[PDB]
From a paper:
The membrane transport protein [name] is part of the arginine-dependent acid resistance system of [name]. Functional studies have shown that [name] is an obligate exchanger, coupling influx of L-arginine with efflux of agmatine across the lipid bilayer.
[name] is homodimeric and each monomer consists of twelve transmembrane α-helices (TMs) with intracellular N- and C-termini. The significant increase in resolution in the presented high-resolution structure, allowed us to identify twenty-one and fifteen water molecules in monomers A and B, respectively. In summary, we suggest that binding of L-arginine to [name] in the outward-open conformation replaces water molecules H2O3, H2O5, H2O6, H2O7, H2O13, H2O17, and H2O19. We identified a heart-shaped cavity at the interface of the [name] dimer that is lined by mostly hydrophobic amino acids, F84, L85, V363, L366, F414, L417, and M418, and a few polar groups, Q88, Y367, and T421. Therefore, we hypothesized the presence of a dynamic interfacial water network and placed water molecules into these Fo-Fc densities during refinement. This resulted in the identification of eleven water molecules in the interdimeric cavity. In all cases, the thermostability of [name] was significantly reduced, supporting the importance of water for dimer stabilization.
Residue numbers in the entry:
A (entry chain A): 5 to 441
B (entry chain B): 6 to 441
The structure:
C-alpha cells in the first residue's frame, strides 16, 4: 500500500490547484462590477473558508478515512446520509469538470484560434478529459505529480502580480472604483460574497483523497490548511493589485484580465505566458477532480453504498473501472459545448451541481462536533466557535445563490432519498426496527 | 380510551384538515386553466391516494405518536427524526395564520368591520387562542368541535356536488376547456401547481395516533377515508361549478361558491355558504394545532425537541407546548395588520407549506425500509404504490416557486447546524471514533 501513496507537497498543491483552478484568473473581472470594497467581502470569505479548512483538518486528523465527507457523514448519521453525501459529491466532481475543460481549452485558443469553433472545442475537450482519466488510471502519484507541475505553472502569473505588480499599483486607481455596485455597503459586500464564497470549493480535496495520501493523519490537515492559505493569499493579493493597476472600466469588460493586462504590459509573449499558465491550472484541476470522483465512489462502494463496480481496483488499488465510468459520463455531458444553445442548456446543470458540494461541507461540520466532542477538552468553545463559523460559511453561500439552482438541488435530494429507499430496502438496517413480522 | 378519539371524529379531522380553506377557493384558482383541470385532478388523486395508502400501511405497522417523525426516526435515526419534527411542527402552526385569516374573512360577509386590518388582526388572535384553549381542554373536545365544523363545511360542497348537476351544462364546461394559453401538458402542469397542494393533511391521523382509539385499526381507516372524502368533494364540486358558471365570472370571483350562491338562491344562500366556509377553516385551526402539539410532544419524549414540549397535564395533553404554539402564532398573526405586513409574511407561509413534503418523503422511505418484511407476495404492489407516492411529493416541489424551495433548502441547512450544536455529546454515532 505504502508504495502508491502521495507525499505532502503534491497533496497541498492539489488542494490549492483544485480551489484556484479556472476561477482565479477571472476573479478580478467578476469583482470589478462591485469595486475595491470587495476587500471586505474577501475578509469575510477568508475567515469562513479558513474556518471550514480547520474543520476538515481536525476531522481528517481524528479520522483519516477514504472518501472524506462521505465517511464522516456515514459515521455520524449512518448509511443513508453517507449514501446521499457520496451521490451529491461524486456528481459535483465530474459534472464540474465539463465547465473546467471548456475554460482551459479556451485559454489554449490564444495559441490555436481554431479551438474557438464549437465542434473542434467539443472534440478537443473530450480528448483532454480522457487524457486526465488515463493519467488517473496510471495512478494517484502520476496525477498529483502532473497537477503539482500545472499548479506551480498556474501560480506564475498570480504570484508574479501579487509580488511585483505593486510597483505599478496606484491607490488612486483602486479607490476611484471603491464602490461601483450602486449598492450600500452591506449590499456591495453581499455582491462580493456571491462570487468569493464559491472560490474555496476544493478545500475538502485532501480529506476526500485521504486513502491515497502518505501519513494522512499528519498530511491531510497540513495540506488542507496550507492549500486554503495559498489560495487565500493568492486571491487577495492578486485581485487587489490588479484593481490598483487597471482602471475599473477596462477591468469590467475584460474576458481575461490577467492576460489582457499582461499582453499590453510586457508584450505579446506576456499574454502568451499568462494564457498558457491559466490553461495549465485548469487542466491540472481536471486531473485532481477526477481523482476525487474515483475516490468518493470507491469509498462508498467499499461500504456497500454505491454500485460494486466503483470499488473494483487494480493491484495498486486504483478504481480503474470507476474512473472509466466517470470518463464516459463526462464525455456525454461534454456534448453540451457543441453549440451556444447546447452550452446554455448544460449551464443550469453545472450551476446546480456546484450547490451539491455544500451538503458534504455541512455534514462534515456536523460530524466534527458529533464525533469529536470527546477530543476537544478545554478548547471546546474554540471548536464550537470555529465550526459555527464554518456552518455560516456554507449557509451564507446558499443564501446568496440563484433560487432556481437551489430549488433543483432540493429536488435532487428528494430523488436521492427515493432512490435509496427503492434500492436499499431489505439491505438497510434500521436504528429502531419494527418487531419481527 | 377515556380521552381517546373515535373513528368518525378522526376521519373528519383528516378530511377537514385537508379541505380547510382551499376547497371553497379551488374553482377560482382552476378557472385560469379551464375544464382540462379534470386531467390534473386525475393525476393528483392517484398520487394522493398513493400517499394515503403509504400512511395507512405505515401507521398499521407502527401506530406511533407523531406519525412521520416517529417513522423517520425509526428508519434513519435521531437526526432525521429531529429534522422531520422541526419541519412539520413549523408547518402546522405557521399554516394556521393564513387559515384564520381566510376563516375570519369569510365571516366578514356578516360583519364587514372584519375587513379592517386592525379588527381582523385582533379577531384572528382571539380565534387562535380559542382553538389553543379548546386543545388544552383536550383532544376529544377539539376533535368533536372540528367534526361539527367539518360537516357544516360539507353542506355547500356536497350540496353542489350532488344537486349542482341539475344546473350543470356541458356546453359551459367545454367552452372553457383550455383557457390557459398553453398546450395540453402545460395546462395539466398549471393544474397540478394548484391541486397537488390540496391534499396536505393526509398524515393527520398518523400524527395524532397517540390520541386515537385502537389506532392500529382506526388510523389507517381514517387516513384513506379522509382522503377519499376530500377527493370526491374536490372533483365533484369544481367540475359542477365549472359547468354552472361562465369561466369569465369564475375567474374574477373571490368566493365562487359564495358569489354563485348569493346570486342563485338569494342572499340567504350566500350567508349559508359564508358561514359553512368559515366553519371549515376555523375547525381546521383546531386540528392543525392538535397536530403541532402531538409532533412536538413525540419528538420531546425521545429527547429530540425541548423538554417543555413533553410536559403534560394529568390527561397527557401537552399544555405548555400548546401555549407556546399559541404565543408563536400570535406573534406572526401580527402580519395581518396591514397589506404590507401580510405580503411580508407571505413568503414565510409559502415556504412553510413546502416543509410538509419532507415528512411525506421520509414516510414513503420508512415504509419500504421498515416494512419490507411484511410485504410478502404483494411486494410489487407496495413498491409501485410507494413509487407513486414518491413521485407525488417530488412533482409537488418540481412545480413550486423557486424562491420558496430555495428557502426550504436553507432551512434544512440551519436545522442541521442546530442539531449539531445542540446535540453533540448526547447524540450517539452509528460508527463512532475510538475512545480519546
Ligand atoms: C445532476 C442533476 C442536475 C439536475 C438539474 C435539473 C435542471 C432542470 C432544467 O430545467 C428545465 O427547464 C426548466 C427550468 O429552467 C424546468 O421547469 C424544466 O422542468 C426543466 O426541464
Ligand atoms: C374523466 C376523464 C376525462 C374526461 C374527459 C371529458 C371530455 C374530454 C374532452 O376531450 C377533449 O376535448 C377537447 C375540446 O373539445 C378537444 O380539443 C380534445 O381533442 C378532446 O379530446
Ligand atoms: C421558518 C420559515 C423560513 C423563512 C423564510 C424566510 C424568507 C426570507 C426572505 O427574505 C425576503 O425575501 C427575499 C428572498 O426571497 C430576500 O432577499 C429579501 O431580503 C427579503 O424581502
Ligand atoms: C513525471 C511527469 C512529469 C509531469 C509534467 C506534466 C506537466 C503538465 C502541465 C499541464
Ligand atoms: C363536547 C361539546 C361539543 C361542542 C360542539 C360545538 C361545535 C361548534 C363548531 C362550530
Ligand atoms: C505527462 C503527461 C502530461 C500531459 C497533460 C497535458 C494535457 C494536454
Ligand atoms: C515541506 C513544506 C511543506 C509545506 C506545506 C504548505
Ligand atoms: C392524464 C393524461 C391525459 C392526456 C389527454 C390528452
Ligand atoms: C363547547 C364549546 C365549543 C366552542 C366552539 C368554538
Ligand atoms: C407505560 C407508560 C409509557 C409512557 C410512554 C411515554
Ligand atoms: C422554543 C421555546 C423553547 C422554550 C425553552 C424554555
Ligand atoms: C403550564 C404553563 C405553560 C407556560 C409556557 C410558556
Amino acid at each position: 500500500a505504502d508504495a502508491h501513496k502521495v507525499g505532502l507537497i503534491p497533496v497541498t498543491l492539489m488542494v490549492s490547484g483544485n480551489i484556484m483552478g479556472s476561477g482565479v484568473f477571472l476573479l478580478p473581472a467578476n469583482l470589478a462590477s462591485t469595486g475595491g470594497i470587495a476587500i471586505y467581502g474577501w475578509l469575510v470569505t477568508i475567515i469562513g473558508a479558513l474556518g471550514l479548512s480547520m474543520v476538515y483538518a481536525k476531522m481528517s486528523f481524528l479520522d483519516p478515512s477514504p472518501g472524506g465527507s462521505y465517511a464522516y457523514a456515514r459515521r455520524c448519521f449512518g448509511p443513508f446520509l453517507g449514501y446521499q453525501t457520496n451521490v451529491l459529491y461524486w456528481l459535483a466532481c465530474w459534472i464540474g469538470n465539463i465547465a473546467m475543460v471548456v475554460i482551459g481549452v479556451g485559454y489554449l485558443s490564444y495559441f490555436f484560434p481554431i479551438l474557438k469553433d464549437p465542434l473542434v472545442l467539443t472534440i478537443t475537450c473530450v480528448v483532454v478529459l480522457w487524457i486526465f482519466v488515463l493519467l488517473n488510471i496510471v495512478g494517484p502519484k502520476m496525477i498529483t505529480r502532473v497537477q503539482a507541475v500545472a499548479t506551480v505553472l498556474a501560480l506564475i502569473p498570480i504570484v508574479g502580480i501579487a509580488v511585483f505588480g505593486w510597483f505599478w499599483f496606484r491607490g488612486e486607481t483602486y479607490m476611484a472604483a471603491w464602490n461601483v455596485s450602486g449598492l450600500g455597503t452591506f449590499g456591495a459586500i453581499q455582491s462580493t460574497l456571491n462570487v468569493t464564497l464559491w472560490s474555496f470549493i476544493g478545500v475538502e480535496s485532501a480529506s476526500v483523497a485521504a486513502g491515497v495520501v502518505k501519513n494522512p493523519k499528519r498530511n491531510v490537515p497540513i495540506a488542507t490548511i496550507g492549500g486554503v492559505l495559498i489560495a487565500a493569499v493568492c486571491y487577495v493579493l492578486s485581485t487587489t493589485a490588479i484593481m490598483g493597476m487597471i482602471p475599473n472600466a477596462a477591468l469590467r469588460v475584460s474576458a481575461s484580465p490577467f492576460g489582457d493586462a499582461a499582453r499590453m504590459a510586457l508584450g505579446d509573449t506576456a499574454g502568451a505566458i499568462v494564457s498558457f499558465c491559466a490553461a495549465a491550472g485548469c487542466l491540472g484541476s481536471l486531473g485532481g477532480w477526477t481523482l476525487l470522483a474515483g475516490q468518493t465512489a470507491k469509498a462508498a462502494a467499499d461500504d456497500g453504498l454505491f454500485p460494486p463496480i466503483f470499488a473494483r481496483v487494480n493491484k495498486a488499488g486504483t478504481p480503474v473501472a470507476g474512473l472509466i465510468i466517470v470518463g464516459i459520463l463526462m464525455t456525454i455531458f461534454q456534448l453540451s459545448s457543441i453549440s451556444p444553445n447546447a452550452t446554455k442548456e448544460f449551464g443550469l446543470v453545472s450551476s446546480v451541481s456546484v450547490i451539491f458540494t455544500l451538503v458534504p461541507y455541512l455534514y462534515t461540520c456536523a460530524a466534527l462536533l458529533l464525533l469529536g466532542h470527546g477530543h476537544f477538552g478545554k478548547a471546546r468553545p474554540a471548536y464550537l466557535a470555529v465550526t459555527t463559523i464554518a456552518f455560516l460559511y456554507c449557509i451564507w453561500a446558499v443564501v446568496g445563490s440563484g433560487a432556481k439552482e437551489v430549488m433543483w438541488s432540493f429536488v435532487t435530494l428528494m430523488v436521492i432519498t427515493a432512490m435509496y429507499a427503492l434500492n436499499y430496502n431489505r439491505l438497510h438496517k434500521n436504528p429502531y426496527p419494527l418487531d419481527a413480522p
